[PDB]
Design a protein around this ligand. Structure first.
Ligand SMILES: *[C@H](O)[C@H](C[C@@H]1CCNC1=O)NC(=O)[C@H](CC(C)C)NC(=O)OCc1ccccc1
Length: 300
């Protein structure tokens, strides 16, 4: 009974890039790469608790009003441009600890790492999973805007997320480094709603395989459901369509349960667990990808 737990990738490369950026009373995090610092543009808003006119804020932006710092290092701001909802600051000094990196976007249902930082101090690291609506269930609180999401893929560091805001339902909204807010959300204190959650089927199947590997089998019966039939069902029950079962071959082989037996399990279990649990959860979990589960269980 090893169980199943959300893991992060190490944060070592990312920590030395974090700086503190402030403008007026606002204080948040920046990402210092080469001679550039990146942070949410709302750092410039004179009042972030009411609707913001960003065209009017930028016009009155005076560079000298920025304070960017790390340790005893105070960076000078030589210029500042919007890149979508991200503010981009050319500073007078190159970050000697800049790692080799690239930028990419995260897709619905994919996992990545958060380094959560409080006004410049990196404080925690934990894995997250992008929800259907482009949000994540982070744990962001006051001071953590500009915290950074990243993934390591074959020895290559990708920066993928910059944190911006929290929705009424406790879901969290961020941007990629092209300055597009994931899910299209605006960077405003509008009482925006997330929209309905569509659970990732691939991920829920991964999670059920993890439970089987761990010796929990109650939710498997002597019935299965074909991919096509399951997809017809998921379109009308807030689940994603499953395009292929190839992703799960290893899990199916190791557990002797076909993906199709687990599609049947989802349809039954979505109506309720009947008092029982699965890896301690009393409801379906879609936070782990198939790949995440295979590496964690087998190290492939
Ligand atoms: C920036 O650090 C901050 C992070 C929020 C604060 C608490 N949890 C978070 O994720 N972002 C904002 O304060 C943001 C500003 C833009 C909308 C211009 N406003 C916001 O997120 O309001 C929602 C909220 C605020 C305070 C507590 C709970 C939700």
């Amino acid at each position: 009974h090893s169980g199943l737990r959300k893991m992060a990738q190490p944060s070592g490369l990312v920590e030395p890039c974090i700086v503190r950026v402030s403008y007026g009373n606002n204080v948040l995090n920046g990402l210092w790469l080469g001679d550039e610092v990146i942070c949410p543009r709302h750092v410039i808003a004179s009042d972030t608790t009411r609707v913001i006119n960003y065209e009017n804020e930028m016009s009155s932006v005076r560079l000298h009003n920025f304070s960017v710092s790390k340790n005893n290092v105070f960076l000078g701001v030589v210029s500042a441009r919007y890149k979508g909802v991200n503010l981009v600051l050319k500073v007078n000094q190159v970050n000697p600890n800049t790692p080799e990196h690239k930028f990419k976007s995260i897709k619905a249902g994919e996992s990545f790492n958060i380094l959560a930082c409080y006004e410049g101090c990196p404080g925690s690291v934990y894995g997250v999973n992008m929800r259907s609506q482009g949000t994540i269930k982070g744990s962001f609180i006051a001071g953590t805007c500009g915290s950074v999401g990243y993934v390591l893929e074959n020895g290559i560091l990708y920066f993928v997320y910059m944190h911006h805001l929290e929705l009424g339902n406790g879901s969290h909204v961020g941007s990629n480094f092209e300055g597009e807010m994931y899910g299209g959300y605006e960077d405003q204190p509008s009482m925006q709603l997330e929209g309905t959650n569509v659970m990732s089927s691939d991920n829920v199947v991964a999670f059920l395989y993890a439970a089987l590997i761990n010796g929990e089998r109650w939710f498997v019966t002597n019935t299965s459901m074909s991919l096509e039939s399951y997809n017809t069902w998921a379109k009308t029950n807030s689940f994603t369509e499953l395009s292929s079962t190839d992703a799960f071959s290893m899990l199916a082989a190791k557990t002797g349960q076909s993906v199709e037996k687990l599609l049947d399990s989802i349809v039954r279990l979505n109506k309720g667990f009947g008092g029982r649990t699965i890896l301690s959860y009393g409801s379906l979990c879609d936070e782990f990808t198939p790949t995440e589960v295979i590496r964690q269980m087998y190290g492939v």
